[PDB]
């Protein structure tokens, strides 16, 4: 109930929300069915349209008009946006040459440059080039301001998850908006696009920018607009708020357009019907910039033109049906479409079994257009697991496809020709970013970046301290002329030990053997030099990683590799080695096939043992520095040390051996040498963060050897590939991955074939940022380079996507 018989007179688009049953007049009252009786009349005036005409110039103010062309309109803040153009000989903003905005040029009384966020739904990245002819205002912002070729959304590449990520800098698993549609079980409640539940604050976690601003005394325009409020009216309302007295005027505003998403669903991303919605968005930008110019604010406000996700060609005939795979199809509930999420229809059903549902959907048709995952097995770069609203079973759907439960769901629920939601690395899902204004750089292109980074920058633009978030603060400093945040490297928490030779061979009882008893002060001083770190500058090119938590670990030096060996987890946390372009691959000599050697620098009590691997019928082992890449037959013995060994399932050893034997050398050949850092990851609670020892759910049978959930590698070389990786004078280039450590290769439908047909495709899917590995390990990389820290932060957020050119 609302006693909607008060009035909006002098309260139109009021900024403080009123509590029931006093009637509301804010830009969201329609959506709550709570506006005062006279809201349309007073606040949604439409008379005479949105543009001044010659004959309206100097008119007598008629308060009925949607906007004004009267002499007093500028000081009242309510002229039509084209007023000065039509009535005062002025040019449209788009027709003016751009001129560098070196300092903010604001009216007296402005304490900071305002921020206007202009968001556009479904604005795919390639529209910037493909629609350029019809979007002159947008093309001017882009070419004169700061822009990226594209901006990566979050997964799922849906509307609410991405808009709320923009607002909070958090992954959807952390902010809680994990789809356009969701079920929470603690609430026992459902969130839907239509309906009232989506309004309860309990869905919306984190701290969005408007709240961050408000808490720190920066005033915010209300961000959300009722759908029926036309765009011209949203623009005029923003412009009117910008004319409020200093103590009442907000510093941050949002505009939102439903286009081009709305038409894109109907006509597909490049349908001929799409030219008009792009024209109409551009004209709205034009109205904003014209209105700002009239108010002498076009060189004062920072404008962000940003999309939430792109749009792909998707039609009814490209739908996979779970009914074609499953017999129990009514014992399940499917969140369908461009992703799939599956749960049990009834929790009173103890017959329900996820493992047989997964098996029933795995590699069942040759051209199958989705792949099932338990959520913890999804690629870690998606960060899509640590929420009770994300169902244990997930379907990653091929681009251009849908998944549904039964065919009846599709003809009783072809309309649509476009949709979105797919893996956030898919080119069609990429969206846009342009920053224009005194705080952004002038005519500057920046590399593609992720939308989780923008919250920190918007905070910087407004002088706010950001709430804790998933951006890497400083990684987008290169977007900014001023207001940069000067990040600093985290302090190392644990310092390493540097053990020397402290144990005799016979003190070990590990059940390991090696055929290594083949017996010179030339090569004896030399081997001693290597063990003390004489070659360390070669294999550790960016300094040793810092350990950011409390633990006990040793640095171990070798001719070919250096490692930081954990006495707690009984294996390296990291192993670092360089492979030059000229390096040679060799085989494991026959006599050394099962060779494992005690390490006389490390106690029996802090070592793994071979007997546990013998007894564990499921678990085998691999090596972090690969024996295949040894620099000499003598150095090869170092690779068989028990301190270089890690637990590996045989199914996983297929992947790992191919990477180490074939792919490392291929990368060194292609990139002119590479530096590799590899190691284990433990994330048994799938929160994206390093596990403590008490979180480990799996050990090599009968031992305290913990089993990794994943294995990572970070592969760095010179951006200028004419310089070898080990003598690089400038910026670096990196690709990384986090491979799931799985006891089968069910994820790879082609795994019965030779590794050359499936391994690299798997590794591509599990591409990762350095930063993702940092969260998962408590390590901090690139501590000693010749590069500025902000550049290194950019490097750490880089993701190698393997997509073709946009």
Ligand X SMILES: *[C@@H]1O[C@H](CO)[C@@H](O[C@@H]2O[C@H](CO)[C@@H](O[C@@H]3O[C@H](CO[C@H]4O[C@H](CO)[C@@H](O)[C@H](O[C@H]5O[C@H](CO)[C@@H](O)[C@H](O)[C@@H]5O[C@H]5O[C@H](CO)[C@@H](O)[C@H](O)[C@@H]5O)[C@@H]4O)[C@@H](O)[C@H](O[C@H]4O[C@H](CO)[C@@H](O)[C@H](O)[C@@H]4O[C@H]4O[C@H](CO)[C@@H](O)[C@H](O)[C@@H]4O)[C@@H]3O)[C@H](O)[C@H]2NC(C)=O)[C@H](O)[C@H]1NC(C)=O
Ligand Y SMILES: O=C(c1ccc2[nH]nnc2c1)N1C[C@@H]2[C@H](C1)[C@H]1CN(C(=O)c3cc(OCC4CC4)c(Cl)cn3)C[C@@H]21
- Kindly list the catalytic residues: 159
Q: Checking phi first, is residue 278 left (phi over 0); if not, alpha (psi -120 to 50) or beta?
A: alpha
261 is in an annotated binding site: yes
Check if the beta carbon of residue 364 is closer than 8 Å to that of residue 341. no
Q: Which is nearer to ligand Y, 123 or 223 (CB)?
A: 223
Write out the binding residues for Na ion, residues 737-756 only, by CB under 5 A: 745, 748, 751
Beta carbon of residue 770, minimum distance to Ca ion (angstroms, whole number): 18
Beta carbon of residue 191, minimum distance to ligand X (angstroms, whole number): 12
Q: Does 774 bind Ca ion (CB under 5 A)?
A: no
Beta carbon of residue 172, minimum distance to ligand X (angstroms, whole number): 9
CA distances from 6 to 3, 25, 39, 524, 654 (A): 8, 10, 10, 94, 73
Q: Nearest 5°: phi and psi at 563? A: -140, 155
Q: Which is nearer to Na ion, 745 or 797 (CB)?
A: 745
Beta carbon of residue 685, minimum distance to Ca ion (angstroms, whole number): 5
Write out the binding residues for ligand X, residues 640-699 only, by CB under 6 A: 687-689
Residues 6+ apart with CB under 8 A from 608: 510, 570, 571, 642, 645, 700, 703, 705
Convert 574-602 into a string of H (helix), E (strand) and C (coil): EEEEEECCCCCCCCCCHHHCCCCECCCCC
Q: Does 17 bind ligand Y (CB under 6 A)?
A: no
Q: Does 176 bind ligand X (CB under 6 A)?
A: yes
Tell how many helices (H) and how many strands (E) occur in the chain. 23, 29
Q: Does 175 bind ligand X (CB under 6 A)?
A: yes
Token pair of 396 as six digits: 């990653």
Residues 6+ apart with CB under 8 A from 353: none
386 is in an annotated binding site: no
CA distances from 290 to 53, 235, 248, 390, 436 (A): 15, 11, 23, 45, 15
Q: Which of ligand X, Cl ion, K ion, none has residue 386 at its interface (CB below 5 to 8 Å by kind)? A: ligand X
Check if the beta carbon of residue 128 is closer than 8 Å to that of residue 333. no
Q: Does 196 bind ligand Y (CB under 6 A)?
A: no
Q: Does 380 bind ligand X (CB under 6 A)?
A: no
Q: How far apart are CA 417 and CA 264, in angstroms?
A: 7
Q: How far apart are CA 414 and CA 405, in angstroms?
A: 17
Q: How far apart are CA 84 and CA 41, in angstroms?
A: 27
Residue range at the interface with Cl ion (CB under 5 A); choices 176-184, 308-316, 614-622, 692-700: 176-184
Q: Does 685 bind Ca ion (CB under 5 A)?
A: yes
Q: How far apart are CA 641 and CA 767, in angstroms?
A: 29
Check if the beta carbon of residue 388 is closer than 8 Å to that of residue 184. yes
Q: Does 387 bind ligand X (CB under 6 A)?
A: yes
Q: Which is nearer to ligand X, 182 or 242 (CB)?
A: 182
Candidates 114, 179, 250, 418: give the one binding Cl ion (CB under 5 A). 179
Candidates 25, 135, 235, 254: give the one binding ligand Y (CB under 6 A). 254
Q: Which is nearer to Na ion, 650 or 702 (CB)?
A: 650
Q: Which is nearer to Ca ion, 280 or 687 (CB)?
A: 687
Q: Tell me if residue 154 falls in helix, strand or coil.
A: coil
Q: How deeply is 178 buried, as exposed, middle or buried, from its count of CB atoms within 10 A (0-12, 13-18, 19+)? A: buried
Write out the binding residues for ligand X, residues 189-208 only, by CB under 6 A: 205-206
121 is in an annotated binding site: yes
Q: Which is nearer to Ca ion, 537 or 693 (CB)?
A: 693
Q: Does 166 bind ligand Y (CB under 6 A)?
A: yes
159 is in an annotated binding site: yes
Q: Which is nearer to Na ion, 371 or 710 (CB)?
A: 371
Contact track, Cl ion, 180-209, x by CB under 5 A: xx----------------------------
Q: Does 333 bind Cl ion (CB under 5 A)?
A: no
Q: Which of ligand Y, Cl ion, ligand X, none has residue 170 at its interface (CB below 5 to 8 Å by kind)? A: ligand X
367 is in an annotated binding site: no
Check if the beta carbon of residue 354 is closer than 8 Å to that of residue 374. yes
Q: Which of Cl ion, Ca ion, ligand X, none has residue 131 at its interface (CB below 5 to 8 Å by kind)? A: none
Check if the beta carbon of residue 683 is closer than 8 Å to that of residue 769. no
Q: Which of ligand X, K ion, Ca ion, none has residue 391 at its interface (CB below 5 to 8 Å by kind)? A: none
Q: Does 608 bind Na ion (CB under 5 A)?
A: no
Q: Which is nearer to ligand X, 104 or 169 (CB)?
A: 169
Q: Does 469 bind ligand X (CB under 6 A)?
A: yes
Residues 6+ apart with CB under 8 A from 465: 212, 216, 459
Q: Does 646 bind K ion (CB under 5 A)?
A: no
Q: Does 373 bind Na ion (CB under 5 A)?
A: no
766 is in an annotated binding site: no
Residue range at the interface with Cl ion (CB under 5 A); choices 143-151, 174-182, 187-195, 202-210: 174-182
Q: How far apart are CA 173 and CA 186, in angstroms?
A: 16
Q: Which of Na ion, ligand X, Cl ion, none has residue 745 at its interface (CB below 5 to 8 Å by kind)? A: Na ion
Q: Which of Ca ion, Cl ion, ligand Y, none has residue 510 at its interface (CB below 5 to 8 Å by kind)? A: none
Q: What is the DSSP string of 640-664?
A: GBGGGEEEE-HHHHHHHHHIIIIIH
Residue range at the interface with ligand X (CB under 6 A); choices 13-21, 124-132, 188-196, 383-391: 383-391
Candidates 26, 78, 261, 747: give the one binding ligand Y (CB under 6 A). 261
501: number of Cβ within 10 Å: 10
Q: Which is nearer to K ion, 412 or 617 (CB)?
A: 617
Q: What is the DSSP string of 206-240?
A: S--HHHHHHHTT--B------TTS-HHHHHHHHHH
Q: Which is nearer to Cl ion, 249 or 343 (CB)?
A: 343
Beta strands at 252-260 and 115-121: parallel, antiparallel or unpaired: parallel
* Closest to 483 (Cα-Cα) out of 219, 93, 798, 146: 146
CA distances from 672 to 138, 542, 558, 719, 784 (A): 41, 17, 23, 10, 21
Q: Which of Na ion, ligand X, ligand Y, none has residue 494 at its interface (CB below 5 to 8 Å by kind)? A: none
Q: Which residue is nearest to ligand X (CB)?
A: 205
Q: Does 381 bind ligand X (CB under 6 A)?
A: no
Beta carbon of residue 680, minimum distance to Ca ion (angstroms, whole number): 13
Check if the beta carbon of residue 542 is closer than 8 Å to that of residue 532. no
Token pair of 729 as six digits: 């004078």
420 is in an annotated binding site: yes
Q: How far apart are CA 387 and CA 175, in angstroms?
A: 9
Q: Does 616 bind K ion (CB under 5 A)?
A: yes
- Our measurement of the distance from residue 775's CA atom to the centroid of its chain's CA atoms, rounded to an integer in Å, reads 14
Q: Nearest 5°: phi and psi at 197? A: -60, -40
Beta carbon of residue 335, minimum distance to Cl ion (angstroms, whole number): 6
Residues 6+ apart with CB under 8 A from 164: 170, 172, 175, 177, 204, 206, 208
Candidates 152, 265, 383, 665: give the one binding ligand X (CB under 6 A). 383
Candidates 20, 49, 468, 743: give the one binding ligand X (CB under 6 A). 468
Q: How far apart are CA 550 and CA 692, in angstroms?
A: 10
* Closest to 599 (Cα-Cα) out of 577, 621, 570, 629: 570
Interface positions with Ca ion (CB under 5 A): 683, 685, 687, 689, 691
Positions at the binding site: 121, 159, 180, 261, 265, 308-309, 420, 683, 685, 687, 689, 691
Interface positions with Na ion (CB under 5 A): 745, 748, 751
Interface positions with K ion (CB under 5 A): 613, 616, 619
Interface positions with ligand Y (CB under 6 A): 117, 119, 121, 159-160, 163-164, 166-167, 180, 193, 223-225, 227, 254, 256, 258, 261
Interface positions with Cl ion (CB under 5 A): 179-181
Positions at the binding site for Ca(2+): 683, 685, 687, 689, 691
Interface positions with ligand X (CB under 6 A): 170-171, 173-176, 205-206, 383, 386-387, 468-470, 687-689, 775
């Amino acid at each position: 109930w609302t006693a909607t018989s008060g009035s909006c007179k002098g309260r139109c688009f009021e900024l403080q929300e009123v509590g029931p049953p006093d009637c509301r007049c804010d830009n969201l009252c329609k959506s709550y069915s709570s506006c005062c009786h006279d809201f349309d009349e007073l606040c949604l005036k439409t008379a005479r349209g949105w543009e001044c005409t010659k004959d309206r110039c100097g008119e007598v103010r008629n308060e009925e008009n949607a906007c004004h062309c009267s002499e007093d309109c500028l000081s009242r803040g309510d002229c039509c946006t084209n007023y000065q153009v039509v009535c005062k000989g002025e040019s449209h903003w788009v027709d003016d040459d751009c001129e560098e905005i070196k300092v903010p040029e604001c009216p007296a009384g402005f304490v900071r440059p305002p921020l206007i966020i202009f968001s556009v739904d479904g604005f795919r990245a390639s529209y910037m080039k493909k629609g350029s002819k019809v979007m002159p205002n947008i093309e001017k912002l882009r070419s004169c301001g700061t822009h990226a070729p594209y901006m990566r959304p979050v997964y799922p590449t849906k509307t609410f998850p991405n808009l709320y990520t923009l607002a909070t800098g958090l992954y959807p698993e952390s902010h809680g908006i994990v789809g356009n549609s969701m079920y929470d079980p603690v609430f026992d409640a459902s969130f839907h696009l239509r309906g009232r539940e989506k309004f309860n604050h309990r869905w919306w976690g984190g701290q969005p920018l408007w709240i961050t601003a408000t808490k720190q005394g920066v005033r915010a325009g209300t961000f959300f607009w009722s759908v029926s409020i036309p765009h011209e009216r949203r623009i005029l309302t923003i412009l009117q708020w910008l004319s409020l007295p200093d103590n009442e005027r907000p510093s941050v505003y949002a505009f939102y357009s439903e286009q081009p998403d709305f038409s894109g669903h109907k006509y597909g991303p490049f349908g001929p019907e799409m030219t008009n919605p792009l024209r109409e968005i551009d004209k709205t930008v034009g109205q904003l910039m014209d209105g700002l110019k009239q108010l002498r604010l076009h060189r004062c406000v920072n404008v962000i033109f940003v999309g939430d996700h792109g749009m792909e060609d998707v039609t009814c005939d490209r739908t996979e049906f779970l009914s074609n795979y499953l017999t129990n199809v009514d014992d399940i509930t499917l969140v369908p479409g461009t992703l799939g999420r599956i749960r049990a229809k009834s929790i009173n059903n103890s017959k329900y079994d996820p493992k047989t549902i997964i098996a029933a959907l795995t590699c069942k048709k040759p051209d199958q257009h989705f792949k099932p995952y338990m959520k913890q097995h999804l690629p870690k770069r998606l960060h899509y697991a640590n929420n009770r609203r994300i169902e244990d079973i997930h379907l990653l759907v091929d681009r251009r496809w849908h998944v549904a439960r039964k065919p009846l769901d599709v003809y009783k629920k072809c309309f649509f020709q476009g949709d979105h939601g797919f893996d956030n690395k898919v080119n069609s899902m990429q969206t846009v970013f342009v920053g224009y204004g005194p705080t952004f750089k002038y005519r500057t292109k920046v590399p593609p970046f992720e939308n989780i980074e923008l919250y920190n920058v918007m905070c910087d633009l407004l002088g706010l301290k950001p709430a804790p978030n998933n951006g890497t603060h400083g990684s987008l400093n290169h977007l900014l002329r001023t207001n940069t945040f000067r990040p600093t490297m985290p302090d190392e928490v644990s310092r390493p030990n540097y053990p020397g030779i402290m144990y005799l061979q016979s003190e070990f009882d590990l059940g390991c053997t090696c055929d290594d008893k083949v017996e010179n002060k030339l090569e004896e001083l030399n081997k001693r030099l290597h063990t003390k770190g004489s070659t360390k500058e070669r294999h550790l090119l960016y300094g040793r990683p810092a350990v950011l938590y409390r633990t006990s670990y040793d640095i171990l030096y070798h001719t070919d590799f250096e490692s930081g060996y954990s006495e707690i987890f009984l294996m390296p946390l990291w192993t670092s080695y360089t492979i030059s372009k000229q390096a040679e691959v060799s085989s494991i000599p026959e006599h050394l096939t099962n060779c494992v050697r005690p390490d006389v620098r490390v106690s029996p009590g802090f070592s793994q043992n071979c007997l546990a691997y013998k007894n564990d019928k499921q678990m085998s082992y691999g090596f972090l520095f690969p024996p295949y890449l040894s620099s000499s037959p003598e150095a090869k013995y170092d690779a068989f040390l028990v301190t270089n060994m890690v637990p590996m399932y045989p199914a996983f050893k297929r992947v790992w051996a191919y990477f180490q034997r074939v792919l490392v050398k291929k990368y060194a050949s292609e990139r002119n040498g590479v530096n590799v850092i590899s190691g284990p990851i433990f994330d048994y609670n799938y929160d994206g963060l390093r596990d403590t020892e008490d979180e480990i759910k799996q050990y090599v049978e009968g031992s305290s050897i913990p089993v990794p959930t994943h294995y990572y590698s970070i592969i760095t070389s010179c951006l200028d590939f004419t310089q070898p990786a080990d003598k690089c004078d400038g910026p670096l280039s990196v690709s990384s991955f986090i491979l799931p450590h799985r006891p089968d290769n069910d994820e790879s439908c082609n795994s019965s074939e030779d590794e050359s047909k499936w391994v690299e495709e798997l590794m591509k899917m599990h591409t990762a940022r350095v930063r993702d590995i940092e969260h998962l390990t408590g390590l901090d990389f690139y501590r000693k380079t010749s590069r500025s820290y902000s550049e290194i932060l950019t490097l750490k957020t880089y993701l190698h996507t393997y997509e073709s050119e946009i």
